[PDB]
Design a protein around this ligand. Structure first.
Ligand SMILES: Cc1cc2nc3c(=O)[nH]c(=O)nc-3n(C[C@H](O)[C@H](O)[C@H](O)COP(=O)(O)OP(=O)(O)OC[C@H]3O[C@@H](n4cnc5c(N)ncnc54)[C@H](O)[C@@H]3O)c2cc1C
Length: 585
């Protein structure tokens, strides 16, 4: 069965682009429209009768049947935008999908490239298994493995997300919010490129899952400055031989082995406070190295006053850095690994990297609400943008996923009509615990974990803060859409300037430009003479009729002499181009 082959190719895809393409090919073959999100998942599992697929349906159905989701109707009418397809953005997206919301994720990259390896708490392993992780990554947490690379976690969550009808757009950089206009269009996003279909999306919830670079306004950062702290990560090719399998992991609770560090410093000049080894798709090491040792070995060329000069690509000898990392890895595993060949990163270089942990950040607040021109927008942070992890402690995914579930619960309460201040008060009451969570003070009964915070935080007081304590987090300060669409799509075209839906169309160049924007094979826009008003109009009209099936409302000569085109007719005509092409860039 060809649909089975397409499903297999989707499941087995090894890149973000390859996953998106296999999924689109599966949907086309099955004649399914993911953008009709309220029915997509049910139609897909009805149409695809494949034993492999049915195994996955049972897991997702079981997850979605929890009473917290209200059978998928708690958020049926809520539109959410997620910034970032990292693990925490995608995990949030997935729970928002199970509540019935429409969800769109925009991601500025188009590849999952990070090889570094993430520690997983037991509850997260159980969460991921329950989402079908093993059907996308057969080796997932095999035996006593409790880690996974960043990019493999991204691939699993991407696949789950696509199955549920979540929309994922790569090569889209979020730049800002666009307030609603006056007098009905809601909140929108400024994205690059602004011609992207997602510029049409109006949403009531936006989630910042874009790590440190996140620049949603209204989230003041708390700074935690400590002693100079430098971490080095490294990945080596893992050929899964028997020699390689025998080498024992180094857990990262193991450093509390200080004699080893003294021996290592005296034998090699490498002075570490901690080193971690995970045996995963790569042999992954992370270590924290003292500044003086890195100068002594030539990794850092000059000792600058403070760090961002100290750790600049100009002040760091890459070959010495590679040597230092390999040497530390080899000694820490006692030269039992046959070979230490660097895996190759995004840029085609050996995969070593250095990071500054001297200052870490966390948002004062997880959420806020914006209201303008009658439209309310729930804004919240999740993941590294909310609370930065110190990798050796293994809290990144655990607290990202707690906050993902907390955010889902917040959006559930929003959609059910809870007043904004009570939504915020509850969210902030939950958020106050996040930097105290450990595998032992968080709930133990994984089989009953749900987005309901009571299932995850024993004895939580969700009314710790009063609504009056979060007043400062509520901030009060012609199809116009069609017009805005034509403006963005025609921007940059010589001779065109769309300021209305009548006068700006008499020359014919604007519509020729709309056609060229989406079907450059049908028209040479550059060859056109702006003075040939009748010829250019009629060319646009004929192409649209013959190639696009849009019936003309007038002739070129009628347009060339009209004075002002009827606007009801202009709008009926232009809207057909809008509907044909708006989702289609
Ligand atoms: C280079 C690097 C190495 C790391 N190494 C380790 C490690 O060894 N061990 C460890 O435990 N943790 C490590 N981490 C942290 C770990 O990746 C995160 O804790 C984890 O992935 C969860 O973070 P997140 O999903 O919130 O954000 P991230 O994983 O940072 O994902 C953010 C996503 O948002 C996208 N994005 C950013 N800005 C925009 C925008 N304007 N528009 C659209 N998309 C945008 C980014 O491309 C990215 O895909 C590393 C992080 C980085 C950046």
């Amino acid at each position: 069965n060809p649909a089975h082959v397409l499903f297999d190719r989707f499941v087995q895809a090894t890149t973000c682009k390859g996953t998106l393409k296999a999924f689109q090919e599966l949907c086309d073959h099955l004649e399914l429209k993911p953008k009709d999100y309220r029915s997509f998942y049910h139609k897909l599992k009805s149409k695809l009768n494949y034993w492999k697929a049915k195994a996955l349906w049972a897991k997702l159905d079981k997850r979605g049947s929890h009473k917290d989701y209200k059978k998928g109707k708690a958020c049926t009418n809520t539109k959410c935008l997620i910034i970032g397809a990292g693990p925490c953005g995608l995990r949030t997206a997935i729970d928002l999908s199970l509540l019935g919301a429409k969800v769109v994720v925009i991601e500025k990259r188009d590849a999952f490239s990070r090889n570094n390896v993430l520690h997983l708490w037991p509850f997260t392993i159980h969460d991921l298994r329950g989402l079908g992780a093993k059907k996308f990554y057969g080796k997932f947490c095999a035996g006593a493995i409790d880690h996974i690379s960043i990019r493999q976690l991204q691939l699993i969550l991407l696949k789950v997300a696509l199955i549920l009808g979540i929309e994922i757009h790569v090569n889209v950089e979020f730049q800002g919010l666009i307030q609603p206009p006056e007098d009905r269009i809601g909140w929108r996003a400024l994205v690059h490129p602004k011609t992207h279909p997602v510029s049409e999306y109006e949403f009531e919830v936006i989630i910042g899952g874009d790590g440190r670079r996140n620049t949603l306004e209204g989230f003041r950062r708390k700074e935690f400055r400590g002693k100079l702290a430098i971490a080095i990560t490294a990945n080596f090719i893992n050929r899964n031989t028997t020699a390689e399998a025998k080498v024992e992991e180094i857990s990262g609770v193991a450093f509390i082995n200080q004699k080893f560090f003294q021996e290592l410093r005296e034998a090699t000049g490498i002075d570490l406070e901690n080193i971690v080894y995970y045996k995963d798709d790569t042999h992954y090491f992370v270590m924290t190295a003292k500044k003086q040792s890195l100068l002594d070995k030539g990794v850092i060329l000059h000792d600058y006053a403070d760090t961002e000069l100290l750790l600049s690509r100009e002040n760091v000898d890459q070959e010495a850095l590679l040597s230092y990392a390999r040497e530390a890895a080899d000694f820490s595993t006692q030269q039992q690994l046959p070979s230490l060949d660097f895996a190759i990163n995004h840029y085609g270089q050996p995969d070593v990297a250095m990071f500054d942990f001297t200052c870490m950040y966390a948002s004062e607040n997880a959420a806020l609400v914006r209201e303008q021109n009658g439209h309310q927008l729930l804004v919240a942070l999740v993941g590294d943008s909310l609370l930065e992890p110190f990798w050796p402690m293994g809290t990144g995914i655990a607290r990202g996923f707690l906050a993902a579930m907390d955010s889902a619960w917040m959006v559930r309460s929003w959609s059910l009509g809870t007043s904004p201040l009570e939504v915020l008060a509850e969210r902030e009451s939950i958020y106050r615990l996040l930097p105290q969570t450990t595998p032992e003070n968080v709930s133990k009964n994984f089989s009953q974990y749900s987005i309901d915070p009571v299932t995850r935080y024993p004895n939580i007081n969700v009314n710790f803060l009063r609504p009056s304590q979060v007043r400062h987090l509520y901030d009060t300060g012609r199809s116009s859409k069609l017009l805005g669409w034509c403006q963005r799509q025609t921007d940059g075209y010589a001779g065109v300037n769309v300021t209305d839906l009548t006068m700006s169309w008499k020359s014919g160049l604007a519509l020729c430009a709309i056609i060229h924007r989406y079907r450059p094979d049908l028209i040479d826009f550059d060859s056109l003479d702006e003075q040939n008003v009748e010829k250019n109009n009629q060319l646009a009209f004929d192409i649209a009729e013959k190639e696009l099936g849009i019936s003309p409302i007038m002739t070129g000569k009628e347009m060339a002499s009209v004075g002002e085109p009827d606007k009801l007719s202009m709008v009926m005509y232009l809207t057909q181009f809008y509907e044909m092409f708006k989702d289609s860039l």
